[PDB]
């Protein structure tokens, strides 16, 4: 199975946030650390995406665009899995040095979103999602959000997306109940990503007022790309309507 071999081989390692776990949980410190984690993770997502099968079929402008729209969903899905595997979905395992208990959920001012991410994480346990199903789904999430007006070379994207879907159905193989449930789970990422998009955008707008630090690449992406999503110019591809 050349496909699974490559997915397994490219899967990123452990990324730490550099959070100071000796200081008191404050909003400013937690969110600044989540932003720095987002930045560190983005480096890894770019290297990962560019090593995926087919990914270079895309126009270079589409490659960047698809990353810049999909990172939130990709990260959130990966964090849900780590949470499941490491702490049985009891807490959110953003990183080894940044694990959210309920207290940090509350202090983060993102409690409802954290709760939703926690539900997502319990879904990996409740559905008995296998590591290989996880890997295939995560790869598909890269090809699940695009401009309503299409991409520069949209045909290559449609063919890529078709192939990733085929690969998932294949690792699945009333067996169609399975595909129903995996597709529903993938869809469930998107509303979570949308609320995080709204949260992080509002946080960027008010970042000086609340003393939260955004790194460079996070600030650019959230001011240039994320509003295209929130304004409806760029929209998730749902399986179910």
């Amino acid at each position: 199975p050349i496909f699974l071999n490559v997915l397994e081989a490219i899967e990123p390692g452990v990324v730490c946030a550099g959070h100071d776990n000796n200081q008191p949980d404050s909003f400013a410190a937690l969110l600044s650390s989540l932003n720095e984690l987002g930045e560190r993770q983005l480096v890894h997502v770019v290297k990962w995406a560019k090593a995926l099968p087919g990914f270079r079929n895309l126009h270079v402008d589409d490659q960047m665009a698809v990353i810049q729209y999909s990172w939130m969903g990709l990260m959130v899905f990966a964090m849900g899995w780590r949470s499941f595997t490491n702490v049985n979905s009891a807490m959110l395992y953003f990183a080894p040095d940044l694990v959210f208990n309920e207290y940090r959920m509350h202090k983060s001012r993102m409690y409802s979103q954290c709760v939703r991410m926690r539900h997502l994480s319990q879904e990996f346990g409740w559905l008995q999602i296998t590591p290989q199903e996880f890997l295939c789904m995560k790869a598909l999430l890269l090809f699940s959000i695009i401009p309503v007006d299409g991409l520069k070379n949209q045909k290559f994207f449609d063919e890529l997306r078709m192939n990733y879907i085929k690969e998932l159905d294949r690792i699945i193989a009333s067996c169609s109940r399975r595909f129903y449930q995996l597709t529903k789970l993938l869809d469930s990422v998107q509303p979570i990503a949308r609320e995080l998009h709204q949260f992080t955008f509002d946080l960027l707008i008010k970042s000086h007022m609340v003393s939260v630090d955004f790194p460079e690449m996070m600030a650019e992406i959230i001011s240039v790309q994320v509003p295209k999503i929130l304004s409806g110019k760029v929209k998730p591809i749902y399986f179910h309507t």
Partner: peptide, 8 residues
């Protein structure tokens, strides 16, 4: 572009 710098 910050992210384009990183992309390439």
């Amino acid at each position: 572009g910050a992210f384009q710098n990183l992309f390439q």
